[PDB]
Design a protein around this ligand. Sequence first.
Ligand code: NA
Length: 62
Amino acid sequence: DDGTQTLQGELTLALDKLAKNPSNPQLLAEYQSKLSEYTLYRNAQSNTVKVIKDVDAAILEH
Ligand code: NA
């Protein structure tokens, strides 16, 4: 049950709904939101490393 694989499945289904009814602005917004959610997921991974670097910086300043 991989997370990024699941998010991609949700993205595919959102694209599918939009593809069938492209004049529905709500389906467009939902696809956009899902796509952003995927990018936020990647930003969160680099954010953890950034936190660790900050922790190390604090450790050095004793
Ligand atoms: Na979600």
